[PDB]
RNA sequence: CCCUGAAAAUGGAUGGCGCUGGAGCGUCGGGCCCAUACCCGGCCGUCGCCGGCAGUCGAGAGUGGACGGGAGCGGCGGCCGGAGCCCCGCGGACGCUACGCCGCGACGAGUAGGAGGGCCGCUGCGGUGAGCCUUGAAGCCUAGGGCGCGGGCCCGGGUGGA
């Protein structure tokens, strides 16, 4: 159960970073990096994540399925997107809103997706 | 498109009451009971690419900033400066003689023409007398003396809005790195239109000041303070 | 300067359970929501009772 | 030049000068670190006129403006590139600084990653 | 006697007090009387259902004066502008303590 | 070519007897010695012009040693001229008894 | 009212200077000056409302709504008439570490003493950071930059050598 697990790890985790007047959670499948019940990526049955691709270009989205809850080896389906930004977030937006897959991190994803894509394009001197 | 039909005797209160205006507005007889575009269809542009491309304006944003700022509340006031109410001091009337207190022409006596739409005062000294051209002044930084000359029935050209007197800027055409500083535009150019307009206004006001004796010398003078008099005792 | 006595200013009463029993913490969240979002006074006493100490929640004999 | 924060409100400090401990001046054995004077005759403990002030909660800075760096940001401590990524989503309300302990070669890589992540670094030129 | 100064307010005075510095005790909170519905939410049962009702209920004491006076927060006036010429002696002896007949209206104009 | 400002003397900060509030100063406009005549200067902007060592930039002018502390008149202070005024920074006490100008700035006349 | 009555020791006290059409005395007036007192406003914290937020419910909706004839009107389809389910757009800020976040009111002295909080601090231990570290740790110095009301802390530079 998410809630029971959240009480366990709300203040005791290896991913917890409590620094000056700040808290940050470093679990791999979390958006906004903030320690919160809503955004934690470990305790929820259905979770979403936005990571940079293995190569520099493109982004990767990770979705947790519903059957293999107890089996992390196949509890995440990862796919990569390497198209234009406007196409990406619109494509991303369809993963959450259209599929009703936790329509609360919808913007946290696209906001994170917008950030990572803007990171990969080269800096200007 | 009728007029207000409710004369105002004090700001916020009309002359008449609710019932009085109901009769005045004739509301008794006129009682009424009751009773695009986002996208555009562009052509196909084939061949065999059939299906007209339904293009939509205001395409979705290509990037979102990491956070943003929540919108402000509503104010119901705070109208922009363009539509502010222009208040002019009572002593300031078209034709009075003012004294500039702040700028390069500090202490100079000039005549006051009409007041601009911004509230700025458009005045000119009789440039032959004090070298003060048609130039805006602020009513809070001048002193309105008790001397007035009849500048009624003089034709101030209508094309003298604040935009006309607005300062012009040139920097910078296709230069960002600053290594060749511009040696031009430092000499501000007195445009011919300003020259002829200044002649046009001065040609008709100069006869009006020469009527009253020793007023040109009065305007040729510059106001000053002595170790004697004090402004709080002076009558201007 | 207003003359009042502040010794009774802070009402002393259980505001959250002292224990760290998470299961006990859980239904506290549940019943706190229940009393907040209902007019049922019965919830308030139950929510009030969940805070009180073991000695203040004496075991109730079957008989 | 630098990276602007989300907002730059007018930081207001209720007091700027530090609270120096009573009689820090006269004796060197007494450090400037504050201590509450608990004495029967202690004339600053009694809050006499024209004396050393006390700290008290009245000097608390604004909740919005607490812990603002002089440039619209808040601080965070990192020790290597890994903790920098948790800032990628704040990125406008918090700035990171390299810990004093981080060697040059590690810290050189971090700032590069920091620049490409649009993260404001308090001490970029720290080993160079 | 020496801690107070009291008199008989007039209609203008009672008007000024409740309007300029009138505050209500709603839910044991000092709430400014910025809206009439605040009065009705608490004093509607007694027929006091607008600003003017509170004035009328006070100026001439009504059957429900006690509730109305308790509803009003005590007025927190500024210091009397222009001084008061004494504090420790009675009004009849040139001070301010005690009962002045109706000059309390003057003092009210100087307080708020 | 004109003095263009009335001369004043910095007569001290607003103060009790054993307490002194530095944030407002007591100015003495020369030529006014009663409360009533203070209404003319009652809103005028005042300036304290003083010379320093290191040169400072000057608006519409070249850098020089001239610095200035700006301020404006707040109200008259007590029965005989003696206007009290505020400044952007509290006046340094070394300016006691020196020249303060009131600039004849914004005039209601 | 004033004078006499009326004499102490270092040189001295309406506080001093001085003050006599008053800067003395008695009764009065109008102004003016300021305390951390009072009014308003901003901020900090405490307490109280055992206040609000699980409705992230852009479709969510009830101060009753539902079926299923009843006999009727009020209006649009020539005197018979009756479904509309989102959408040309596929879209709609942040939030809720619930030990969190938000709102409002009042309040704020304090020895002895009691209590709460401390992401104040030291040392050692079980874990935890794919933690830091000879590309320089601890420590020490510093007119360096800062944070926190504070306990204290982070970073720059120098030395240092594990
Ligand atoms: Mg108080
Ligand atoms: Mg107390
Ligand atoms: Mg400080
Ligand atoms: Mg010392
Ligand atoms: Mg004592
Ligand atoms: Mg002693
Ligand atoms: Mg006054
Ligand atoms: Mg007494
Ligand atoms: Mg005698
Ligand atoms: Mg206290
Ligand atoms: Mg070192």
UniProtKB/Swiss-Prot annotation, chain A:
Q: Which family does it belong to?
A: Belongs to the eukaryotic ribosomal protein eL28 family.
Give the principal location in a single coarse category.
cytoplasm
Q: Which residues carry this modification: N-acetylserine?
A: 1
- What keywords appear on the UniProt entry? Acetylation, Cytoplasm, Isopeptide bond, Phosphoprotein, Ribonucleoprotein, Ribosomal protein, Ubl conjugation
GO-annotated biological processes: cytoplasmic translation; translation
- UniProt cross-references to PANTHER family, sorted A to Z: 60S RIBOSOMAL PROTEIN L28
Q: Which domain of life is it from?
A: Eukaryota
The protein here is known as Large ribosomal subunit protein eL28
Q: How does it assemble?
A: Component of the large ribosomal subunit.
Q: Where in the cell is it found?
A: Cytoplasm
Q: Which residues carry this modification: Phosphoserine?
A: 114
**Keyword Ribonucleoprotein part of the UniProt annotation:** yes
| Classification via InterPro entries | Ribosomal_eL28, Ribosomal_eL28/Mak16
Q: Which residues cross the membrane?
A: none
Q: Tell whether Acetylation is among the UniProt keywords.
A: yes
| Covalent cross-link Glycyl lysine isopeptide (Lys-Gly) (interchain with G-Cter in SUMO2) as placed by the record, residue numbers | 57, 64
Q: Name one Pfam family in it.
A: Ribosomal_L28e
> What Gene3D superfamilies has UniProt attached to this entry?
3.30.390.110
According to its UniProt entry, the function of this protein is described as:
Component of the large ribosomal subunit. The ribosome is a large ribonucleoprotein complex responsible for the synthesis of proteins in the cell.
List, in alphabetical order, the Gene Ontology terms for molecular function in this entry: RNA binding; structural constituent of ribosome
Query: What GO cellular component term, any one, is given?
Result: cytosolic ribosome
> Which organism is this entry from?
Homo sapiens
**Organism taxonomic ancestry:** Eukaryota, Metazoa, Chordata, Craniata, Vertebrata
UniProtKB/Swiss-Prot annotation, chain C:
What cellular component GO annotations does this protein have?
cytoplasm; cytosol; cytosolic large ribosomal subunit; cytosolic ribosome; endoplasmic reticulum; focal adhesion; membrane; nucleolus
Listed under subunit, the entry gives: Component of the large ribosomal subunit.
Which protein is depicted? Large ribosomal subunit protein eL18
- Supply the source organism for this entry: Homo sapiens (Human)
Q: Which disease is it linked to?
A: Diamond-Blackfan anemia 18: A form of Diamond-Blackfan anemia, a congenital non-regenerative hypoplastic anemia that usually presents early in infancy. Diamond-Blackfan anemia is characterized by a moderate to severe macrocytic anemia, erythroblastopenia, and an increased risk of malignancy. 30 to 40% of Diamond-Blackfan anemia patients present with short stature and congenital anomalies, the most frequent being craniofacial (Pierre-Robin syndrome and cleft palate), thumb and urogenital anomalies. DBA18 inheritance is autosomal dominant.
Q: Please give the biological process terms from Gene Ontology that the record holds.
A: cytoplasmic translation; translation
Q: What does this protein do?
A: Component of the large ribosomal subunit. The ribosome is a large ribonucleoprotein complex responsible for the synthesis of proteins in the cell.
Q: What is the effect of changing residue 50 to S?
A: In DBA18; uncertain significance
State where the protein is found: Cytoplasm, Cytosol; Cytoplasm; Rough endoplasmic reticulum
* Family, similarity comment: Belongs to the eukaryotic ribosomal protein eL18 family.
Select a single GO molecular function from the record's annotations and give it. Answer: RNA binding
Swiss-Prot record, chain E:
Cleavable signal peptide: none
Shown portion of the complete protein runs from: 137 to 248 of 248
The entry assigns this protein to a family as follows: Belongs to the universal ribosomal protein uL30 family.
- Which gene is the coding source of this polypeptide chain? RPL7
The protein's name is: Large ribosomal subunit protein uL30
Q: Where found?
A: Cytoplasm
Residues where Phosphotyrosine is found: 3
Assembly and interactions?
A: Component of the large ribosomal subunit. Homodimer. Interacts with DHX33.
Task of the protein: Component of the large ribosomal subunit. The ribosome is a large ribonucleoprotein complex responsible for the synthesis of proteins in the cell. Binds to G-rich structures in 28S rRNA and in mRNAs. Plays a regulatory role in the translation apparatus; inhibits cell-free translation of mRNAs.
From Swiss-Prot, chain F:
Coiled coil located at which positions? none
Q: List residues modified as N6-succinyllysine.
A: 62
Presence of keyword Plastid: no
Residues with the modification N6-acetyllysine, per the entry, are 7, 62
Main location, first listed in the record:
cytoplasm
Q: Which cysteines are joined by disulfide bonds?
A: none
Q: Which disease is it linked to?
A: Diamond-Blackfan anemia 5: A form of Diamond-Blackfan anemia, a congenital non-regenerative hypoplastic anemia that usually presents early in infancy. Diamond-Blackfan anemia is characterized by a moderate to severe macrocytic anemia, erythroblastopenia, and an increased risk of malignancy. 30 to 40% of Diamond-Blackfan anemia patients present with short stature and congenital anomalies, the most frequent being craniofacial (Pierre-Robin syndrome and cleft palate), thumb and urogenital anomalies.
What is known about its subunit structure?
Component of the large ribosomal subunit.
The function of this protein is: Component of the large ribosomal subunit. The ribosome is a large ribonucleoprotein complex responsible for the synthesis of proteins in the cell. Required for the proliferation and viability of hematopoietic cells.
Family designation: Belongs to the eukaryotic ribosomal protein eL33 family.
> What name appears for this protein in its UniProt entry?
Large ribosomal subunit protein eL33
């Amino acid at each position: 159960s998410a809630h029971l697990q959240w009480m366990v790890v709300r203040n005791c985790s290896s991913f917890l970073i409590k620094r000056n007047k700040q808290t940050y959670s470093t679990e791999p499948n979390n958006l906004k990096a903030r320690n919160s019940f809503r955004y934690n990526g470990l305790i929820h049955r259905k979770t979403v994540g936005v990571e940079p691709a293995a190569d520099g270009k493109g982004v990767v989205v990770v979705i947790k399925r519903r059957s293999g809850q107890r089996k992390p080896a196949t509890s995440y389906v990862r796919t990569t997107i390497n198209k234009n930004a406007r196409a990406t977030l619109s494509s991303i937006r369809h993963m959450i809103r259209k599929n009703k897959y936790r329509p609360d991190l919808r913007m946290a994803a696209i906001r994170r997706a917008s950030a990572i894509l803007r990171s990969q394009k080269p800096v200007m001197v | 498109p009728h007029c207000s039909r409710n004369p105002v005797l004090v700001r916020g209160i009309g002359r008449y009451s609710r019932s009085a205006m109901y009769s005045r507005k004739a509301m008794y007889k006129r009682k009424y009971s009751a009773a695009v575009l986002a996208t555009v269809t562009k052509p196909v542009g084939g061949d065999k690419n059939g299906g007209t491309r339904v293009v939509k304006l205001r395409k979705m944003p290509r990037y979102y900033p990491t956070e943003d700022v929540p919108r402000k509340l509503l104010s119901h006031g705070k109208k922009p400066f363009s539509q502010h109410v222009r208040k002019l001091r009572a002593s300031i009337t078209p034709g009075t003689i003012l004294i500039i207190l702040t700028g390069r022409h500090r202490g100079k006596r000039v005549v006051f023409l009409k007041q601009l739409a911004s509230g700025l005062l458009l005045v000119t000294g009789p440039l032959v007398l004090n070298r003060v051209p048609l130039r805006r002044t602020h009513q809070k930084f001048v002193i309105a003396t008790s001397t007035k000359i009849d500048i009624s029935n003089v034709k101030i050209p209508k094309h003298l809005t604040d935009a006309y007197f607005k300062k012009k800027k040139l920097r910078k055409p296709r230069h960002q790195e600053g290594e060749i500083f511009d040696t031009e535009k430092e000499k501000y150019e007195i445009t011919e239109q300003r020259k002829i307009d200044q002649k046009a206004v001065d040609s008709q006001i100069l006869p009006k000041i020469k009527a009253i004796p020793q007023l040109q010398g009065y305007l040729r003078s510059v106001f000053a303070l002595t170790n004697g008099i004090y402004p709080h005792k002076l009558v201007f | 300067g207003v003359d009042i006595r502040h010794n009774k200013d802070r009402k002393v009463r259980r505001k959250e359970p002292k224990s760290q029993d998470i299961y006990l913490r859980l239904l506290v969240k549940l019943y706190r929501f229940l009393a907040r979002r209902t007019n049922s006074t019965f919830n308030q006493v139950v929510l009030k009772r969940l805070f009180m100490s073991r000695t203040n929640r004496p075991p109730l004999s079957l008989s | 030049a630098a990276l602007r924060p989300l907002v730059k409100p007018k930081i207001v400090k209720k007091r700027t000068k530090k609270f120096i401990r009573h009689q820090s001046d006269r004796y060197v054995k007494i450090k400037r670190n504050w201590r509450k004077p608990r004495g029967i005759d202690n004339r600053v403990r009694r809050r006499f006129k024209g004396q050393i002030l006390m700290p008290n909660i009245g000097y608390g800075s604004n909740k919005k403006t607490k812990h603002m760096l002089p440039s619209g940001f808040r601080k965070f401590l990192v020790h290597n590139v890994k903790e920098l990524e948790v800032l990628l989503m704040c990125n406008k309300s918090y700035c990171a600084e390299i810990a004093h302990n981080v060697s040059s070669k590690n810290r050189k890589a971090i700032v590069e990653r920091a620049a490409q992540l649009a993260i404001r670094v308090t001490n970029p030129n720290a080993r160079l | 006697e020496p801690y107070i100064a009291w008199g008989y307010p007039n209609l203008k005075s009672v008007n000024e007090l409740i309007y300029k510095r009138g505050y209500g005790k709603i839910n044991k909170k000092r709430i400014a009387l910025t809206d009439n519905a605040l009065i009705a939410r608490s004093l509607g049962k007694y027929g006091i259902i607008c600003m003017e009702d509170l004035i009328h209920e006070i100026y001439t004491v009504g059957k429900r004066f006690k509730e109305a006076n308790n509803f009003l927060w005590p007025f927190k006036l500024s210091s009397p502008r222009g001084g008061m010429k004494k504090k420790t002696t009675h009004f009849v002896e040139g001070g301010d303590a005690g009962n002045r007949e109706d000059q309390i209206n003057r003092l009210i104009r100087r307080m708020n | 070519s004109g003095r263009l400002w009335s001369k004043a003397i910095f007569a001290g900060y607003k103060r009790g007897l054993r307490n002194q509030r530095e944030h407002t100063a007591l100015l003495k406009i020369e030529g006014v010695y009663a409360r009533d005549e203070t209404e003319f200067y009652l809103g005028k902007r005042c300036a304290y012009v003083y010379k320093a060592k290191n040169n400072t930039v000057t608006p519409g002018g070249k850098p020089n040693k001239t610095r200035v502390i700006w301020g404006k008149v707040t109200r008259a202070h007590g029965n005989s001229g003696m206007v009290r005024a505020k400044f952007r920074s509290n006046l340094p006490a070394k300016a006691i008894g020196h020249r303060i100008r009131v600039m004849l700035y914004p005039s209601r006349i």
